[PDB]
From Swiss-Prot:
Annotated active site: 44, 93, 188
Binding site for heparin: 160-163
UniProt organism field: Homo sapiens
Spans through the membrane: none
Protein name according to UniProt: Coagulation factor XIa light chain
Residues carrying a glycan: 63, 104
Residues of the full protein shown: 388 to 623 of 625
Gene coding for it: F11
Chain ranges of the Peptidase S1 domain: 1-236
Disulphide bridges: 29-45, 127-194, 158-173, 184-212
Impact noted for substituting residue 200 to S: In FA11D; mutant is not secreted by transfected fibroblasts; dominant-negative effect
Mutagenesis or variant effect for residue 16 to M: In FA11D; dominant-negative mutation that results in severely decreased protein secretion
Amino acid sequence: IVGGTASVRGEWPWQVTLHTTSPTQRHLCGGSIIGNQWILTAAHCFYGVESPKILRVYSGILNQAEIAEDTSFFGVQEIIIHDQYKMAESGYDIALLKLETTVNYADSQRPISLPSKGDRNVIYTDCWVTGWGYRKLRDKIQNTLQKAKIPLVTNEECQKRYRGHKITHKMICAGYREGGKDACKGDSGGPLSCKHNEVWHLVGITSWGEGCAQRERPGVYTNVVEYVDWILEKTQ
Ligand SMILES: NC(N)=NCCCCCNC(=O)[C@H](Cc1ccccc1)NC(=O)c1ccc2[nH]c(=O)cc(O)c2c1
């Protein structure tokens, strides 16, 4: 996260850090608890991942330093990638991880609500992006989970900023005209969480963009409301 601040422990209890153990253990991508056996994340995170056996999901984490060889984690039983996914920039950048055991919910870890189809007309004014990603284009994974408040931008506005791409209605964009606050490398797969009528909704999944926090280059997110049928289908 560029231009963000350290999170409070437990304030983003749906946020997970997905690790790979190969060749040695490291943070791979963000994701969101959406059900007791289910993490929603980006499809592009699994480029070259051959098997779910190399993955570890850690929940209830604030600091990456909490994670050591003796720290408990959730195994991944299955990776489910949208069958129309080819790459982040063309959409369908969404994936489910089916965990090998179920998450026991607590103040430190619990699921985020998916948006309703009735909320397509909602004007979210309180949206946040979170993660352990870079604080600038050339940087490293951060110890402490970062957060930034970022306003949504209209698709028509977003399309003007990415003339070489097609910004579809299955995408949603967010950014300051002047830049300065954004997701960056290592944040991908994580949530764009919006608070509306005192409830947090998983509005986006961090997907792609040009550089990080550049002026007139908003972040592009998978538009989660357009996938509620797919999520239901794939999780039932
Ligand atoms: N909103 C804006 N402006 N851009 C949107 C930002 C989201 C895309 C950025 N890419 C990303 O976030 C890659 C996506 C990716 C993941 C896995 C494999 C390939 C690509 N992530 C990374 O480049 C990435 C992921 C995990 C990492 N772990 C480490 O220990 C060190 C790293 O340098 C590192 C880098």
